Design a protein around this ligand. Structure first.
Ligand SMILES: Cc1cc2nc3c(=O)[nH]c(=O)nc-3n(C[C@H](O)[C@H](O)[C@H](O)COP(=O)(O)OP(=O)(O)OC[C@H]3O[C@@H](n4cnc5c(N)ncnc54)[C@H](O)[C@@H]3O)c2cc1C
Ligand SMILES: Cc1cc2nc3c(=O)[nH]c(=O)nc-3n(C[C@H](O)[C@H](O)[C@H](O)COP(=O)(O)OP(=O)(O)OC[C@H]3O[C@@H](n4cnc5c(N)ncnc54)[C@H](O)[C@@H]3O)c2cc1C
Ligand SMILES: CC1=Nc2ccc(Cl)cc2[C@H](c2ccccc2)N1CCNC(=O)c1ccco1
Ligand SMILES: CC1=Nc2ccc(Cl)cc2[C@H](c2ccccc2)N1CCNC(=O)c1ccco1
Ligand SMILES: [Cl-]
Ligand SMILES: [Cl-]
Ligand SMILES: [Cl-]
Ligand SMILES: [Cl-]
Ligand SMILES: [Cl-]
Ligand SMILES: [Cl-]
Ligand SMILES: [Cl-]
Ligand SMILES: [Cl-]
Ligand SMILES: [Cl-]
Ligand code: NA
Ligand code: NA
Lengths: 484, 489
């Protein structure tokens, strides 16, 4: 048939857009994805990346990894049990996680079957013509048609995909997609990348590794987590190191060779070499524009490969839009959901609406975790004459007793010191992703450091630290960092 | 001949949350000479509170360490769903190691605060019992008995009453066979059977603590004289916490109140309730309330007025009816929270000795209950809002989060409620039940001070996946109050 909306990709942005359209505006909706439940061969599926091979499973797996610390820390509070009997059963975790994700898949299939004006179609979506969306048997454009769908408006929402550098032996490496399905936990693993996915997986592999195991993370520059607060980048590095993860900075794989025993011999650009069981490449993610045949209608892409869009998600082709990681702005699930909701408002609603990409709160589920919203001091120091930085950094008391003395909680607020406006807040330590959520609301109300400081603390919490700081630790004046 | 009393700009009676913030500020920000009196320099019996106050010695700080310890019962069980394996029959909760660990942690804070007195010019500590001899004279005596020897007679321009509160022990037969939270912190063994009496945060928290450490075959029971524990808290939350305590094996007896306690011949306690019901326990912990600790201060010497309830009456600036005598913290019977006593102490010193007169805002204060899982709350419950606002909206989200399907703790429903003035969207109250609630609520306290509306919450982009994001994903009320009445408009 024909439809008001055809959505390519049943993901965060797509499922949101295609549900608002059918339930808030009774529109006729088609949504195409390549698989109806998680895992190989195509990994993402109905629900999107986040649901099948992203935020949702990774969080359950980091929750599993945190028991390594809980079991050990328990002793400090007088819990006694046979330490030598402890094992981390990876196969149970992955089976548990598989069932959880499968239940969400089935449940999203429920909602298709029970909603009129919202139809899901299995297969590979491409642009045949200005208002025709083909669905083929496979990603091969030469492959058999399953459907041609007519559509007023077409939404491009096919997400992103791991970036695999084209070094010799790249094909002996996995990405996070495969990481979710390893049948054994690796004894030696190299995670390649200094960003959140590399870090988060290093912490997961670190808890589930067999006896004698070792996690090594490498990164081509000097300090991991570029784009995060610098004190926190250094402190997470120390805390990952304290929990046994080896961090190799200033190193980059130039070649991977397969050993006869299935292991990998990694050669670095420096000529250093390391043998491991698994190389997980997590150096970035790229917009998933390749199989869409965007040539067939001349939809433009940026120097970086992402669908180019204006503030309202419109491509250069009338009646064709793009939201989510395909656009290459902020690769976060709730950003994509916001974009998709706003699109449908601006197209079958009365009020135009655009997604604000500033002041978006986000989290790294490292162990210990990170919670941030707003500008880091070095970005602030370039756009503002006077910047103040309020910092508190204490190993909390629970962690003196636990034995995890290396677990410092870090709280920083960055301000425009001229009028006291909070430019950014950056947290490291247990609960940080939860603490920062309503911080994002504050930054929307143009909170000042005195609005924080004058709110009465909840005690005892890590969070109250944010309402106890009234004196700057230091400043940037005209870009120059200084004491007073 | 005669010689001079030690003289101060400020004498603070009670070295606790409020008194220490006041004393510190007056001395280090405004150059005042400050005396601070407390009955002990470190935690524990005979007097329990000490240098640092109730929170440091026998309140928030040790209790949170004990609750963290109690949480490992759940973690060790929950870990099995994520694939952790170990010998479950080897598991034991060693109460003695917990108490030893917490004592050490509290003693280091006591030592640290004493070092701060020693290092800080114009800030002096006095060990003993402080009382008002006259409008500008504080005397410190050997014991709480007003006839015990005077150790020091202090000249004081200004006097701050900051002696806190004390457990309320009902006048029933066998009350002397009961304890309070004070003694709970020092039990040599974990009790096998305990009754916590009261339905407020202290009874509830200690019920979870004793539940985790009790020996084989033990039972924890909490009773409350009324229908539903945790009066003052959101009603959905009160009912969920009740269910979640029950699920973890605590016995909740509502509409029951002890009428007497007798000692059994084995030393256990035989509790008879008003209703005629009875219960045998090893420990009866009375946690039915805390009363302003005004009795040893000899306030009649100077005519400081009490309220009908027994707090020192003060105005919005912490002034009593007697010039240069002030009262902050639990002794004033407003909100008994450590950071409120702190805020009162800062505001009072700013007003008296600074150039910034200021009063504490007791509305929209965030607080927590360290139940397992915990409560975080800030602002009005809906039944209070409905009485003051013509249209009130209630946004509710509730569900067992996914980790807890996998963990096996399916009774663990997260609840998030936002209560609004519906005529303009202003958030009046936010109520949370679930893991990390106390941590989530802190920045909510800031939102409310900025008069955030629901539309600010909803407009903010979620952090995924968190429980906190539920607050930013709610756009349609679950129901309303229209002049006092519940419906969906
Ligand atoms: C390991 C990992 C962890 C992450 N963790 C977080 C986190 O904690 N928090 C957070 O906010 N974000 C996280 N993200 C990012 C988040 O998953 C993405 O930002 C989000 O899913 C983007 O949504 P989308 O709508 O743009 O696309 P997706 O949710 O990726 O959906 C795209 C869909 O299109 C389908 N598809 C692709 N091509 C076609 C085609 N040609 N025809 C039909 N269907 C097609 C795919 O099967 C996929 O289901 C994580 C990502 C990864 C990889
Ligand atoms: C078990 C328990 C748990 C608690 N948990 C929390 C929590 O998690 N969060 C929270 O915010 N609040 C909590 N509180 C409450 C918090 O402890 C109090 O609100 C706070 O300590 C009150 O501060 P204050 O300055 O009034 O007095 P306190 O901190 O009680 O200090 C008063 C001091 O005066 C001393 N004193 C008394 N009489 C005399 C005298 N005549 N002469 C000299 N000194 C004297 C006492 O020794 C004491 O050290 C808890 C309380 C209890 C009992
Ligand atoms: C609103 C919504 N947004 C989504 C955003 C991103 C994802 Cl990955 C999933 C959803 C989800 C959904 C699930 C199936 C089809 C379309 C949307 N979904 C549906 C949630 N609501 C209900 O199922 C519901 C049932 C009854 C009333 O509302
Ligand atoms: C500001 C403050 N407020 C308190 C509020 C409540 C309590 Cl219970 C304790 C304090 C603490 C303090 C500790 C000793 C004497 C007076 C104040 N105290 C001082 C903490 N120490 C410092 O700020 C410090 C010590 C050394 C350098 O800075
Ligand atoms: Cl395994
Ligand atoms: Cl890299
Ligand atoms: Cl760098
Ligand atoms: Cl990446
Ligand atoms: Cl967290
Ligand atoms: Cl014991
Ligand atoms: Cl009671
Ligand atoms: Cl009641
Ligand atoms: Cl009480
Ligand atoms: Na504050
Ligand atoms: Na939102």
């Amino acid at each position: 048939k024909a439809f008001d909306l055809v959505v390519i990709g049943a993901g965060s942005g797509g499922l949101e857009a295609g549900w608002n359209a059918a339930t808030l505006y009774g529109k006729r909706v088609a949504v195409v994805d390549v698989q109806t439940s998680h895992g190989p061969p195509f990994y993402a599926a109905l629900g999107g990346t986040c649901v099948n091979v992203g935020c949702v499973p990774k969080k359950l797996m980091v929750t599993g990894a945190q028991y390594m610390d809980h079991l050990r820390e328990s002793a400090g509070f007088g819990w006694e049990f046979d330490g030598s009997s402890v094992k981390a059963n990876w196969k149970k975790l992955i089976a548990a996680k598989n069932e959880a994700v499968l239940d969400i898949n089935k449940s999203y299939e429920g909602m298709f079957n029970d909603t009129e004006g919202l139809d899901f179609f299995l297969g590979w979506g491409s642009l045949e013509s200005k208002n025709v969306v083909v669905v083929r048997e496979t990603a091969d454009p030469k492959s058999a048609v399953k459907e041609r769908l007519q559509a007023d408006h077409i939404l491009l929402a096919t997400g992103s995909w791991p970036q695999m550098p084209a070094i010799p032996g790249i094909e002996h490496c996995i990405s996070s997609n495969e990481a979710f399905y390893l049948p054994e936990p690796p004894r030696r693993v190299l995670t390649v990348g200094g960003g959140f996915i590399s870090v988060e997986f290093a912490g997961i592999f670190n808890a589930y590794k067999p006896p004698g195991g070792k996690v090594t993370l490498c990164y081509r520059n000097n300090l991991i987590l570029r784009g995060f607060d610098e004190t926190i980048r250094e402190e997470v590095t120390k805390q990952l190191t304290a929990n046994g993860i080896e961090i190799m900075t200033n190193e980059n794989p130039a070649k991977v060779s397969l050993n006869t025993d299935g292991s990998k011999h990694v050669t670095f650009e420096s000529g250093k070499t390391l043998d491991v069981d698994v190389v997980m490449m997590a150096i970035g993610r790229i917009p998933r524009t390749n199989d869409l045949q965007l040539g067939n209608v001349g939809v433009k892409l940026t120097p970086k490969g992402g669908v180019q869009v204006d503030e309202f998600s419109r491509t250069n082709v009338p009646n064709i839009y793009a939201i989510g990681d395909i656009t290459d702005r902020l690769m976060l699930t709730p950003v994509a959901i916001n974009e998709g909701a706003a699109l449908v408002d601006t197209v079958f609603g009365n009020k135009p609406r655009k997604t604000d990409h500033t002041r978006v709160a986000s989290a790294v589920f490292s162990i210990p975790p990170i919670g941030t919203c707003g500008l880091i001091e070095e970005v602030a120091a370039k756009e503002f004459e006077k910047v103040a930085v309020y910092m508190s950094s204490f190993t909390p008391l629970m962690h003196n007793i636990s034995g995890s003395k290396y677990k410092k909680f870090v709280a920083k607020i960055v301000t425009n010191h001229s009028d006291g406006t909070v430019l950014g807040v950056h947290l490291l330590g247990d609960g940080a992703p939860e603490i920062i959520q309503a911080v994002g609301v504050c930054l929307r109300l143009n909170a000042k450091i005195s609005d924080f400081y004058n709110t009465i603390g909840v005690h005892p919490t890590s969070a109250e630290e944010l309402c106890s700081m009234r004196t700057p630790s230091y400043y940037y004046v005209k870009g120059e960092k200084m004491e007073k």
